[PDB]
Structure formats: structure tokens, C-alpha cells
Design a protein around this ligand. Structure first.
Ligand SMILES: COc1cc(OC)c(S(=O)(=O)NCc2ccccc2N2CCC(COC(=O)CCC(=O)O)CC2)cc1NC(=O)CCC(=O)O
Ligand SMILES: COc1cc(OC)c(S(=O)(=O)NCc2ccccc2N2CCC(COC(=O)CCC(=O)O)CC2)cc1NC(=O)CCC(=O)O
Ligand SMILES: COc1cc(OC)c(S(=O)(=O)NCc2ccccc2N2CCC(COC(=O)CCC(=O)O)CC2)cc1NC(=O)CCC(=O)O
Lengths: 455, 455, 455
């Protein structure tokens, strides 16, 4: 049986944030959540997360995923572990202790760590990593066999010891029953540290091993925003790598921003500086061009989103959007819809093959198929208090620069004259014209400011 | 005499693409095309490209640049070379064999390789490179003199051999007559490999040399999208380096996207995240700001394109465009034209010094010089079936938010009243007003929803 | 007493620019200005900048910050120093000689250099740096004690010397009185070089030391645009690091463009590809999304700027702007103002809680609080010659797609009908309607082009 303890009871200062550190986001979810997902690879029978500062925010994020215990004050990693004792005391198994601020440790690394632990019959295994700049890290001193002898902190290190490149990531697997017996010994003999338990086990000459991360960047502990941006870069290359391996082309995967749960079908083409966030799905052969920003939306197959922002919406196959369009929450663009430059669609369903190419606002409308909106078309939905709905049937022709004042209905095949203000229904097959009549006055431009003579 | 054989008969799986691998683009042209351009540096008398999968797509891309031969099925690099035998058999000269999927090898490297080959009287020269991680590569085993003894594959390598850092890039120069005699020997004695020919030459103790690429990244073989994005990064730094050496300033040449044939005059200033594609030309002192996207367009000298998209158009000296404007195919912006924010110009010619600063669509128009378009101006060109042309003379003043319904003509110096719908011609020096007359109704706002009392 | 001499009398060719080299910008100010700011850390009693080519442009930039001297022609770094002799000759102190084209040397490095010089009682101290590729640099030859023996140029170097990794950055501290005596000796015995003075001091066996930069990139001399972009990258990481340490989150600090004097409060969140320029200030908890571009503007606390461009303006707490909006010079957005997509505000003050969500131009207006602008609203301010002002009171409702022709006044609580053209004042509490009346014609759509039957 595997257990997991997650330390998320962080008090520290360098984030300069009211938000507790582990809840700071990387690729769309909290650090603490990345860690929970790696922890899931060991299939723990119990996961206890230790909360402290702003416990309830943390508890909202992992609600129903983990048991919680609270450490009422800072007193070391030892005390933090000791808060889990009433849940874990005496159970037989292997317990991972991991911090909620090392969001880059992979599930695959944690499985390798638990496997090493079990296979070598360690009582403790320290997850280590190798760096050419170990300043500040506790060092792993091995004897020649090559068991861990001890962990030596910077401030207590000899000069030969300072040259050890193998350092303590602060992540461990312990035989569970022994972990708690040792902690109680340390507890009654005393701020205490989980590293103290390594001391106890060397005193009883129980076997302490060390499993070395192949990639040191995975060991990053995030204490400030500079490390958080480092984590972000690392995770971005990771997620974009997965996308590319699956058949997604990236002009620049080092500068394209795709959250952890975004899904992307093979043959997608993504230019640099594209942003996909939340529960976004992109269908096969879809092209996303530089500046495109999609939050919580489904885009179908064969679409082209050019430099446009799509929020909480659904977009069918073959749709073209942009450049410079805004699809705002609860819109649906049916198959082969064209939305052009400087068009906003808000809360509206747009039937298949319909076109709005320019300078148009469609707000709170239900629109049929094969509709044309001339440039400058405005739907008017909000009077200061009520929001009204417009219903536009199939094959309606809304002439350029007209104003459709809801609640109105445009019937199938109707037409609205360019420049009209529309305040009443237009039946199927009817036209409606609400505009003023051109009157020319010869020669009069001669007396106006723009005229070349008056210059 | 130099000859070149290009291997482009790729079957492989990791691209997950219907598009044959060598046709995947890097900086605006196919890998295979980058390779053809490096191959051109050796001035070959014959270039034979070996096609296989989807031969005709490949043949379209190199049409009239190379002879083609087809390998009907996968049977090794040896067989692929052997398909060129009826073209090259018996000719006297030095033959480069190169893959169409190594798009970063430079012309200058290939010239250095052919020079080394000729000067050292090699019968074969392997293009090699040095890496600290040679896993998976065939290794170059030299004796002390230091001729090539052999090429050792991973799966056949001794452990001392596994530590060789000199690896086979899979690019070679051969004495031509000997290449084909050796291949026929291997052929009749047998999937066969071009590497087998190195074996034959060591059997006859003919001289096999090795020319080492100074930059290992040049040796990249692209097998999947992760390598394709690597190639893209490498080529981007290359092209941007050339631009900078020639006098172009880059806020961030690591994140600016300029295709291989774009031309850029000295003194240009390019912010990060700009995109130039296709046959684009940018004149002296032109400023391009972050987000700008130019495809197949000529921009003159002293212009400022702020965050705007210009397609298949021509833009004269001194023009300012943006932010957030769209110049769509077949437009011309004359000298000192201003196009402002949220303006689309489509298929229109705009005479010198004309201004459209806001929220305007100019579609299918011929526009004179010194024209002003007030904000919200819409040209209406398409009725559902016909597309019409508008003709606007010099010094016309089109008032804000008016609607110009084509086919109409606005004569020199004419003026259109703000808010008008225009459906007939306006003569030179005339004004035209087609709008409704303001009627005020005192106190009535008191009974509407927006009014502070009704809140 | 410390003195500083800055060499800014650059003639060279590889910039391909009319602009003198040191005036080329990095993060919003000239190289020469970065250098002046590092020089300020030593608290010099005198700073003399040596100008040559286009002296007056240079003199404008440092006007009132430094004494100037002119070198009328290229004759070496020795001559350039010698131009400062009438200002500095005979004064007792330590003189830094530094080039105006090494914009990455830090104030902290220069203080460490002056401290080393004084503490070791050097007569000269060369600022050195260590690189694994020293080709082209003069090398520092030390004896074992380990004083500087000499500086050896590439073209005069022995082969053992060519392997020295310690190179001359071309920055020095000198005992001032000795500097000038030595230069005059070299002068009367002779193009001459500041390095010649090291020769003189070794002849008199005066103590020549060397202080080694910890970071070699700091030593970059900018001679062309490729190095200028390198400087830009280095400075960008520096400025963004400072921001992060202070509590600003960066999705990608390697691709976010913040000038040297921009100020940013803790808890700000900045997506990649954001641009802050000039004297911009960003308040606490403000969110800036990808594409945002702010020049010389103050943004208050709790605002959200989504993909929008703000120039020379002021923006209060809680304001939301974007996506795709343009705030142009001399605008003020009061508290909780919403500016939505495809809206331009130019030279206007917008009272608190006012909303313009779409497709609107507000030009030269004074706007009260709680105003609503329906989509498509256009203010008309310029007639070809005069620019007029519009005054819009509190709680005005300007209906969608209307045209407000200045000079007009909309009184408190007034309403303008959607689609209206407004040419006269609307009193407080009045409505104004200036639009044409809808007329429907049944069945007539049947004979138009869009109709499904006519397809
Ligand atoms: C040229 O494109 C248009 C022309 C046009 O009127 C000629 C109108 S209109 O809207 O003014 N009129 C419709 C129309 C279409 C084709 C041919 C003729 C017409 N109109 C002819 C004039 C009108 C006659 O009005 C009446 O019937 C009044 C009542 C009576 O006389 O009894 C209507 C049809 C609209 C457009 N196009 C667009 O608005 C869309 C542009 C785009 O998609 O970007
Ligand atoms: C203030 O800027 C404008 C004012 C204006 O009317 C006063 C008009 S207008 O278009 O309504 N009229 C033209 C005009 C210009 C200057 C001075 C006066 C006028 N108009 C005065 C009222 C009109 C009189 O109408 C008739 O002649 C009716 C026939 C008759 O009485 O016989 C026309 C000129 C346009 C603008 N400006 C813009 O549209 C462009 C804005 C931009 O570039 O962003
Ligand atoms: C539905 O939203 C609107 C409706 C509307 O008329 C019903 C008008 S209106 O501008 O045409 N009229 C104002 C109005 C509001 C609420 C309820 C009624 C009205 N109008 C009723 C019709 C009008 C009657 O006109 C006259 O009084 C003529 C004179 C007379 O009969 O004596 C005015 C009020 C405006 C809007 N909304 C917007 O423009 C803003 C949209 C946005 O913020 O994006």
C-alpha cells in the first residue's frame, strides 16, 4: 500500500501575495494541483494534505480529492508530518512526503522513486538531484556501497562536503510504521524536521537510500515569482512537446501558451503567441494564427481562427473567424460561418453558412442559416434595464449599417435596407426600409472647409 | 563535374500527416526546398530527386528544378540511390547524396564538403558532426591517419565505440563512377544501404574521408513535429541574423517570424512578434510594431505599420496603418495615406494623403487624393449577387457614419453629410444629405429605464 | 574623489545607421544613458563625456548631466582621453574610463571595480571578464602574485597567450594624476591607445591590477544590431527579474517588453507579449493580457487591460479596457469605466462607471458618470478645419449607431435614439430622435438577389 502526504501549509514571504503560495497557477491550474496529479501515479490508498495558512482556499481547490489536516502554526516539516499521524499511524505501507510547491516533479519520477524504495528495501529513500551549483541545498553524503549516510545542510557543511553535487529535493518515501515511530521519538525529544528521521534511522542502522532525478529542473521548489515563471516555462515546453509528438505543428512552441487540460487533434497548425485556456478542444486541421486567444471553447475541424478571442463558446467545422473578432460567452457559430474583422458575437447562435464580415455587433440573437450581415450592422438588445432577444430567420439579408432594435423578428428571406433603423418585425419575404432620402445641392461644397479652394 | 542526388521518398509515421514529410514548411518554404537551395551552392550539373510517396505533390514543388525518379517501394537508401543509376551511371564526377529532410545544412557547408573530398582524393566522404549525446547515431571509427575505417550502428556497437562523439549525418560525396559500380555489386549480392558502399570501398582499400560540420544543429534530420519546430527556430535565428547584420533593428529576433524570401531595407525597426510572409518587401526606416502581419505585400520607406494585417497589397512611402487595421488582397495605399484603428480596405486603390482613421470599411473603391472618411463610414458593394464599384474623386469629404451604396460616384470636392445613406451620384462640388431630422421631446427621458430616478 | 570619462565619439560602420551608435536604444533609453546610470553608482565628482560624430544629438541626450569635450577626429582611445585633460589634469582621485557602448555594465560592478582599485593601491585596474572563446580580445597576462604584466592583442599574441581566458573589457580605473602624466608621455612620443598607459606603468613598475566581472555578458560591447538585440535580451531579463522579485507575475518574462523606467506595483499579472513603454505606472492587482501596449500612461489598481493600446493617458482603479480598444493621447478613464472591443477614445475625459462596449469613437468629449454609449456610436468633431468639443452630462443614454455632430451638448439624463444623427443640443431629461421611419413592403424580397428562389 502506498500513501501520500502533501505539505501545503506554507508560510513564507517572497511571493508578496495574499494568495497562499501553492495556489499560484502554472499552465492553468495551481502548483498544488500539479503535485496532486503526479502523486496520483503511485495510486495512493490515502492522500493527506497538510494545510495551514488560508486553509479554506486550499480546501476548496482539492475538495473531495484528499483528506485534510491542519497545522495551526509553523514548527517544521516534522511537525507538519506529525499532523497526519492520527490518519496514518500504524498502517503498513510506503509513504511519500512531497511539498505542494514542487509542481514539476512528474508522476513517472514518483513511480520510479517508489519502485526504487521497495526494490532496495530501504526504510527511507530521499529523492535527490544533481547540480553543478549546490549552494544552499542539503547535500547527500553516501558511503561507498552506496547508502545514504546523511544529509548535510549548507550552514553545517564542511568544505569537502560543500563540493557534493547530489542534493536533497525535500521529497521522500518512508516505510510508514517506522516513519511515525521515529517522528514520535524526535517529538518527545524536542521546531523539528523530517530530515531528523534520517538521523534516527542511521542511529538504528536502518537502510536509507537515494533515488536521483534524471532532470534537475524537475526538482524546482517555487518560493517566488521568478521561480514560478521558471515553472511556467518548463511546463509549457512539456505540454507543447506532447502536442507536437501528437501531430500538432508549432511555429514556436517556446512562446505558445496552452493550459494543461487543453485538447488538440492531430494536424492542427498553431502560430506563435497563441493562447488556449481552460477546457478548450481544437479539431483536426484547424489553423490558429498569432494572437488567437480561446478560453473554455470547442473549435471544430478545418476551422481558421485568425487573431481573435473566443470565450465559452462553440465553433463548428469549417468556421473562419477574424482577424480582430471577439466571440463572447454562450455563442455558437454553426458550420462554415464566417465572422470577419471587428465583429463581436455575444450570447447568440449563428446558423450554418451565415456571414458577418465587418464592423458588426450581434448580441442576444437567434440567427438562421445563409444570413448576410452587411458591414456596420448593430443589434440593439439592452434599453438600460431589460435585455431583449432578436430572432432572425434563414437567408435574411440585413443591409450594411443598419440598426436592429430588439425585440424584433426578421422573417425568412426578409431584407433590411442598408442604413435603416428597424423597430418592428419584418415578415418572411418582405423588405423593410427606414432611412432618409438623399438630397443633392449642387455647388454648395464650394463654401465648406474641406474644399480645395478654402485651403 | 558535381552531381546531386536528393532522397525525398520518405515513408515514416511520426509526423502524423497526410502531407509527405519533406513538403512540411520551415520559414515559408518546404524542407525539401531548403535542401535544394543548399545543394545549388555546389553548382551541380544534374540534380536527381528520388520521390516515392505522393510523388506528384513533391513533383509540383520542384517542377523544372530537378530530374525525378521514383522508388516504388521502401528498400533502403541503397535502393533509393540505385533508382538514379539510369541517369547517373558511368558519368565522371563527384556526387552528393543528401536527404530532403535535413533542411538546415548550408550551401557553405556543402561546398566545404565537396572541396574536402576533391582535395583529399577521397573516393567517399561522409559529412559528420560531433555531439556529446551520440545515442542512436552511427559512429565514425577512424584509424590514426585519420581515414574512416567504418561506420558503426548503435545496435552493432561495442561499448568503447558507443563513446565515439563523431557521428554520421547521412550526407555523403562519392566519386560517381565508383558509387554506381559499388552499388551494383551490393545489389546483385542481396533492403540495402548507402552505408554498404563504405564497406565495399574499405574492402578495396579505397580512401574514405570524413568532413566534420562545425555546427551540429545543422545536421538535424526532421522526423516529427518537435524537430520541425527545432528547424524553424534555427532558421529564424539565421534569417533574423542576416537582417540584423544588414541594418534591421529587432526588439527580439528570437520571437519575430520572417520567411526566407522576405526583403528588408536597412534602418527598419521591427518589434517582437511581427510576422512577414511570402514575397514581402519593406522599405528603409519603416517601423513595424508588435502584432503586425504582412503577407505578399510591398511596404515603402518611412511607413509605420502598427499592429495590423496586410495581405497581397502595396503600400507607398510614409503610410501610417493601425493599430488594428486590415488591408486585404489587391489594395494600394498611396503616399502618406493614413489608415487608423478598426478600418478594413479591400480591393481598393487609395490616392495619396487620404485618411480613414476609424471604424470604416472601404470595399472595391477607386479613391482620389486628399479624401477624408469620417469614422463609421461604410461602402456597400455587394447585393447578394453583383459586386459593384464606387468611384470617389479627389478631396471628397465622406461624413462620419454614412453608407455609400455602390455603384455610385462621388465627384471631386463633393461632400456626404454625416449619417447619410447615399444611393445616387453626387456631382463635383455638390453636397448630398440623406438623413432624418433631429426632434427633441422635453422631459420624456424621465420615463425611460436609464434615468437616475427609475433606478 | 572619483571621476568618470565616458567615450562616446564612436566612428564605426556596422550599425548602418545615421544615428550615432551610442544613441541606439535598449529598453527605452540610449546605450549611452544606461552607461551614465551605472557610472552614477561611483558618485563621480566630474563626468566628462567625449563626443565626436554628431556631437549635438549626443549633447541633447545628456544635456545638464555631464561636461562634454570633443574629439575632432579618430586617433585612438588615448587621444579621446586626452581631450578631457584640460578638465581633469592634475586633480587627485580615481578616474573610470568607460565606453558609451557597453550598456550592460552595472553600477554594482563599477563600485566593486573602484573598491578593488583603492583597496589594492593599484595605479591602474583593468575591468576584465572570462570567456571560453577569447578570440579577438586582448588577453590579460598576469604573473603569479598575480599582478597584470600586460594586455596582449590577438594580432600580437603568442599561441600559449591565445589560450588565456581573461580578456580586457576596455573599461579601467586609473589614479588620475598619473593617468594624465602617462598620456602626455605617450603623446609627445607619437593614433595612440589607452592601453599604452598600462605599458608606461609597467616600465615604472607601478601596480597594475585586474578586477574580474562575475558575469561575462555584462561586458558586451555593442558594434552592430545583432549585439544591440543581445543587449536588449539581457536588459529585458534584468528589468523583468526586478519586477518579479517585487511581486509581479509574468507568464513569460523572456518575451514581455517593459522599459527601464516603467513602475509596477506588487500583485500585477502580466501575460506574455505585453509592452510597457516610457513613464508608465501600473497599480496593484492590475491584469495586463497578451498584446497590451501602454506608452506613457498611469493605470490604477484592479484594472484589466485586455489586448489594447493606451497612449499618454490616465486610467483609474477598476477600469476594464478591451479586447481590441485604442485609448489615444490625453484621455482619462474614471473609476470602473468599461471600454469594450473596437472602441477608440481620443482626447476625452470619461466619468466614472460610464460604458462604451462596442464599435464606438469618442473624440474630444467631456463625458459625465454613468453614461451608456450603444454600439456603433460616433462622435463627429472635425469638419475639415475646426475641431469641436462635445459635452455629455451624467447618466446620458446615447442609443446605438447614432452620430453626435459637435459642438453639441447632451444634458444630464438625456437620451439619443438609436440610429439618430444629432446636430443640436438635447436638454437635460429630454430625448432626441433623428432617424427615418421603418416602412415594410410585403413579398418584395422575392425579387431580390439574396432570396433563396433566385439562387
Ligand atoms: C450594392 O449592394 C447593396 C445595394 C443595396 O441597394 C441597391 C442595398 S439596400 O439594402 O439598399 N436594398 C436591397 C436591394 C438589393 C439589390 C437590388 C436592389 C435593392 N434595393 C433596390 C432599392 C430598394 C427599393 O425600395 C423600395 O422598395 C421602397 C418601397 C417602394 O418603392 O414601393 C430596395 C431593394 C444593399 C446592398 N448590400 C448590402 O447592404 C450588404 C453589403 C455587404 O454584405 O457587405
Ligand atoms: C463637426 O464636423 C462635422 C460637422 C458636420 O456638420 C456640421 C458634418 S456634416 O457632414 O453634417 N455637414 C458638412 C458641414 C461642414 C462644415 C460646416 C457645415 C457643414 N454642414 C452644415 C450643415 C449642412 C446644411 O445642409 C444643407 O445644405 C441642406 C440643404 C439646404 O439647406 O439647402 C451641410 C454643411 C460633418 C462633420 N465632420 C465629419 O463628418 C468628419 C469627422 C471625421 O473626419 O472624423
Ligand atoms: C432595446 O434597447 C433599446 C431600445 C430602444 O428603443 C426601444 C432604443 S431607442 O434609443 O430607440 N429609444 C429609447 C427607449 C428606451 C426604452 C423603452 C422605449 C424607448 N423608446 C421608445 C420609443 C421612442 C418613442 O419616440 C418618441 O417619443 C417620438 C416622439 C413622440 O411620440 O412624441 C423613445 C423611447 C435604444 C435601445 N438601446 C440602446 O440603444 C443601447 C444598446 C446598448 O447599450 O448596446
Amino acid at each position: 500500500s502506498n500513501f501520500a502526504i502533501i505539505l501545503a501549509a506554507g508560510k513564507g514571504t517572497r511571493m508578496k501575495s495574499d494568495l497562499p503560495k501553492v495556489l499560484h497557477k502554472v499552465a492553468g491550474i495551481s502548483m498544488l494541483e500539479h503535485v496532486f496529479r503526479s502523486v496520483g501515479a503511485i495510486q495512493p490508498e490515502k492522500t493527506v494534505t497538510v494545510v495551514g495558512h488560508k486553509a479554506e482556499l486550499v480546501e476548496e481547490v482539492l475538495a473531495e480529492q484528499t483528506e485534510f489536516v491542519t497545522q495551526s502554526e509553523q514548527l517544521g516539516t516534522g511537525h507538519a508530518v506529525m499532523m497526519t499521524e492520527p490518519i496514518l499511524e500504524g498502517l503498513s505501507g510506503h509513504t511519500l512526503v512531497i511539498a505542494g510547491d514542487t509542481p514539476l516533479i512528474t508522476g513517472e519520477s514518483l513511480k520510479n522513486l517508489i519502485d526504487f524504495h521497495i526494490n532496495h528495501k530501504n526504510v527511507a529513500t530521499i529523492l535527490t538531484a544533481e547540480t553543478d551549483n549546490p549552494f544552499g541545498y542539503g547535500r547527500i553524503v553516501r558511503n561507498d556501497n552506496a547508502e545514504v549516510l546523511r544529509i548535510v545542510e549548507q550552514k553545517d557543511a564542511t568544505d569537502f562536503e560543500k563540493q557534493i553535487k547530489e542534493i536533497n529535493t525535500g521529497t521522500y518515501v518512508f516505510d510508514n510504521e517506522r516513519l511515525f515511530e521515529a517522528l514520535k521519538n524526535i517529538n518527545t525529544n524536542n521546531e523539528y524536521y523530517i530530515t531528523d528521521v534520517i538521523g534516527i534511522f542511521r542511529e538504528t542502522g536502518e537502510k536509507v537510500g537515494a533515488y536521483t532525478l534524471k532532470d534537475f529542473d524537475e526538482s524546482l521548489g517555487v518560493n517566488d515569482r521568478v521561480a514560478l515563471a521558471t515553472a511556467e516555462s518548463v511546463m509549457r515546453r512539456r505540454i507543447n512537446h506532447k502536442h507536437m509528438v501528437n501531430g500538432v505543428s508549432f511555429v514556436n512552441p517556446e512562446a505558445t501558451y496552452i493550459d494543461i487540460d487543453v485538447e488538440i487533434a492531430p494536424e492542427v497548425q498553431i502560430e506563435a503567441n497563441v493562447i488556449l485556456k481552460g477546457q478548450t478542444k481544437i479539431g483536426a486541421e484547424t489553423v490558429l494564427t498569432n494572437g488567437t486567444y480561446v478560453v473554455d471553447s470547442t473549435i471544430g475541424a478545418g476551422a481558421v481562427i485568425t487573431n481573435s478571442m473566443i470565450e465559452e463558446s462553440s465553433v463548428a467545422d469549417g468556421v473562419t473567424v477574424g482577424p480582430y473578432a471577439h466571440i463572447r460567452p454562450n455563442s455558437s457559430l454553426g458550420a462554415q460561418v464566417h465572422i470577419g474583422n471587428f465583429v463581436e458575437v455575444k450570447g447568440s447562435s449563428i446558423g450554418e453558412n451565415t456571414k458577418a464580415g465587418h464592423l458588426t455587433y450581434i448580441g442576444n440573437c437567434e440567427v438562421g442559416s445563409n444570413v448576410n450581415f452587411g458591414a456596420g450592422t448593430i443589434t440593439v438588445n439592452y434599453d438600460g434595464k431589460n435585455k431583449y432577444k432578436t430572432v432572425i430567420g434563414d437567408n435574411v439579408f440585413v443591409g450594411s449599417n443598419s440598426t436592429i432594435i430588439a425585440p424584433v423578428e426578421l422573417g425568412d428571406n426578409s431584407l433590411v435596407g442598408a442604413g435603416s433603423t428597424i423597430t418592428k418585425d419584418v415578415p418572411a419575404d418582405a423588405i423593410a426600409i427606414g432611412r432618409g432620402r438623399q438630397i443633392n445641392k449642387d455647388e454648395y461644397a464650394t463654401r465648406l472647409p474641406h474644399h480645395p479652394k478654402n485651403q
